[PDB]
Amino acid sequence: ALWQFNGMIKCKIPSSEPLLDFNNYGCYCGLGGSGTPVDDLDRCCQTHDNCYKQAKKLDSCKVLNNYSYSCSNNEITCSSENNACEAFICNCDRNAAICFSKVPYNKEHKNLDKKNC
């Protein structure tokens, strides 16, 4: 699941190792998140956290992961083979991967001290 998100990001940013580059960035990229996002990238992570929060409230997710997707020519496509929960999470992941590829990356915000969140 994390493995798929990591792959989606690499589809959009081929030079990155996402679990290293994007983990522990700002107040929202990484486990949990609170306070105000520090920049646009952190705002991508906040939306992504809110998309997963939304997912946990859908009737279909109740029993809910591991969805199917493809990367081709640097474009991500979620598969129609995905059941409702899986399709919703593939869309949260795809939107965040795209979001990350479109905003600046600030080294000053990597491993930010949470006292700032």
Q: Which segments are annotated as binding site for Ca(2+)?
A: 28, 30, 32, 49
Give min distance, CB of 97 to Ca ion, in A: 15
Q: How far apart are CA 87 and CA 11, in angstroms?
A: 18
Q: Please pick, from the candidates 8, 22, 38, 49, the single residue that binds Ca ion as defined by CB under 5 A.
A: 49
Active site residue 109: no
Q: Which of 48, 59, 109, 113 is catalytic?
A: 48
Q: Buried b vs exposed e over 66-80: b needs ≥16 C-beta within 10 Å?
A: ebebeeeeeebebee
Q: Pick the closer one to Ca ion by CB: 42 or 86.
A: 42
Active site residue 48: yes
- The closest residue (CB) to Ca ion is 33
55 to 39, 67, 75, 100, 117: CA distances (angstroms) = 24, 14, 23, 20, 24
Q: Provide the sign of the torsion angle of the four alpha carbons 51, 56, 61, 66, taken in this order.
A: positive
| Residue whose C-alpha is closest to residue 18's, from 74, 97, 71, 77 | 97
Instruction: State yes or no: residue 37 binds Ca ion (CB under 5 A).
Output: no
Q: Which of 39, 42, 59, 93 is catalytic?
A: 93
Q: Please pick, from the candidates 18, 26, 33, 37, the single residue that binds Ca ion as defined by CB under 5 A.
A: 33
Interface ranges with Ca ion (CB under 5 A): 28, 33, 49
Catalytic site positions: 48, 93
